[PDB]
Subunit: 273 residues, 3 copies
């Protein structure tokens, strides 16, 4: 693919808030434009070096939080990261909690999801003539999941070691009746808006993708229901711990994901017809 | 600031003997001239990469040990390192011991100091119109202190985990009556000449600064009093172990100091009037 | 020495199969031509960055396995690596086993060897007028040996922590009568063809050289004798584990070999007459 500047490559993708990028850490940073067949990624991708590992930072909402979950160009974002050569993708996300013990401030590394989105327009890169049906029974990359969990232990942070993420459409938050269904009927653990189709596309791109979620609220279940202001307040309060995990994890990603602990790394071998 | 070559940046500063720099380790080294408002730093600063971390080496005495402690341009040295963008500063220093159990050859990572210098001419960057009074109750950066101690453990070296450094003016060594005061009255543990005002300035520059001291002698207290030849002999005999600690520590400094374990990292927030 | 491109340097050499090099890991790779007084190394040396450590990859048999053990330009290979500035050399090798418990698939980090080659033409760089006789009582670099063993532990792989490598001339495999001598009379543990004079030369070049061997067969001792096809099949089946060890080890080699655990690092101090 064509990039400007030309010849830019990266090994680890980081998708999350723009505040995750730290210019006091990232060496030789460059803003890069990566052509995609889907138009513009959410913003410039910043490529630079962390402990000799080339990292590509992409704020999914854009800098300044300009793009709500439903309006994100998921195809452009994942195509651009794949085009740069990334093998690992760390997503960092805010989520609501549907269980007491997943408390605001806790990290969660989910292992499952339930897609309840409706309006994302494309849930795949493959519209024909090659039909592709990737197996997403175990949709996250286990190698990266365990690395995120390990970093949490090293740093003394609470990181819940499993969880089912119900992805809703939004942008409005759940009603109480919907939340009762997510919590009591589907038995989901956390709730967010951006996981799908981001993870679908990452899997189709044969990336090792895992999510580091930060609980920001209890959705409808506390005395006062979740608000946008509450979510953003808790995220900004905890972004420093998110960065510490991120910059602890990245230096250990110089190598490749272990294929037998990366469900999607060879997804296309048996997915295409 | 203006540098030659231009655009040089660094993340970790190393202040100590020129023998600490190892061209067999440091990748892409460049000698850099960093303008300061105080004139020349002690020598060229050599910037290069250690395990993907950009390090700036500055010999405080100059190459060849040309500059005694009292003649060092402390302001130029710290300004130049800060101007390059460093966040961490590892100082490596020779010190005398005032206690039997801090033996020649032992490393010491001090946590306190007593300033008994008199002739250093500037003890601060701030002469007005903004008055700055940094809190130096806990003057060293705890994050870096514990990292130096940890490396010592990994390598099997003795590293005393605390100590009070009495900084004297010199260049002449202490009389017996002075040493009795340092040891028995002030209850200092080690003695050197270069800590102040280097640490003051580093703190004002909002750097995470810690000292790795190497005991070279027992000042007046052994049968034969300390001499310059003795200090230099023990330092050169132990410089290889100093390097091993240095190159063990640096690769783990890709990230930022933890603010809550870095007393000076936000010193200016409440220090300026 | 003259290189094309000019000014290329490296810190760690990797000698083994071309399949060890992974373009998904190695940053900023460049093929480099390094002049030697002995003509062409086995192939281009690929220099690039792994976790900020500069690595030089050299396939001893050439890409495509074009050069049998007896035809390898050992002097050119080691001269070229030394000329680039490497301090560490990791050799990865296939070997036969002469003992039940060194099983196909197991790694072995040998500590000794017995040279039974005959036709390698030069066993040294030093033909006069400076006579050089390096001590090779303990011919491998202990620092690197223990690092290879440590990586094996971290990864959960079997790595035998000692072994005597009998190096035969080849290219034909041993007869049964020869194998009985290696196994029962010399009491060797593993057998290969490429160790000598590669290790001699590395030692004379004052490199920290260690071998990570992979058992591929039991030479004559199983029901069916070893064949070339069998060796290559087991190697290709296990190359991924070899890579995982290699890319686990390399990031920890930013520093220098420890002289007191590197028998050859100062070999020339007392070897030359
Ligand atoms: N309660 C919630 N519902 C949906 N998305 C969220 N993101 C953060 N909290 C959320
Ligand atoms: N005894 C001593 N007094 C002052 N500075 C020193 N540096 C090393 N040893 C010393
Ligand atoms: N049995 C064997 N003999 C010699 N070299 C070998 N390399 C691998 N297996 C071998």
């Amino acid at each position: 693919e064509i990039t400007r500047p030309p010849g830019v490559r990266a090994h680890v993708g980081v998708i999350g808030g723009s505040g995750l990028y730290d210019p006091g850490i990232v060496e030789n940073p460059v803003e890069v434009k990566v052509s995609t067949p889907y138009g513009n990624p959410s913003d410039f991708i910043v490529v630079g070096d962390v402990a000799g590992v080339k990292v590509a930072f992409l704020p999914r909402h854009g800098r300044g939080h300009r793009i709500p979950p439903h309006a994100i160009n998921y195809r452009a974002n994942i195509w651009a990261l794949k085009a740069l050569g990334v093998k690992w993708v760390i997503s960092v996300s805010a989520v609501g909690s549907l269980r007491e013990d997943y408390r605001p401030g806790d990290f969660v590394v989910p292992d499952q999801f339930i897609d309840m989105t409706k309006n994302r327009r494309h849930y795949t890169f493959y519209d024909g003539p090659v039909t592709v049906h990737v197996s997403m029974a175990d949709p996250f990359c286990e190698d990266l999941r365990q690395r995120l969990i390990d970093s949490g232990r090293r740093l003394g942070y609470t990181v819940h070691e499993r969880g089912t993420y119900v992805c809703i459409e939004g942008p409005r938050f759940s009603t109480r009746a919907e939340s009762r269904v997510w919590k009591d009927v589907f038995k989901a653990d956390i709730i967010g808006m951006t996981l799908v189709p981001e993870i679908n596309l990452a899997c189709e791109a044969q990336l090792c993708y895992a999510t580091l979620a930060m609980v920001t609220d209890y959705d409808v279940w506390a005395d006062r229901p979740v608000t946008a202001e509450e979510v953003e307040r808790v995220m900004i309060s905890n972004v420093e711990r998110a960065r510490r995990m991120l910059y602890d994890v990245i230096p250990k990603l110089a190598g490749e994901p272990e294929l037998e602990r990366c469900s999607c790394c060879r997804a296309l071998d048996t997915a295409a017809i």
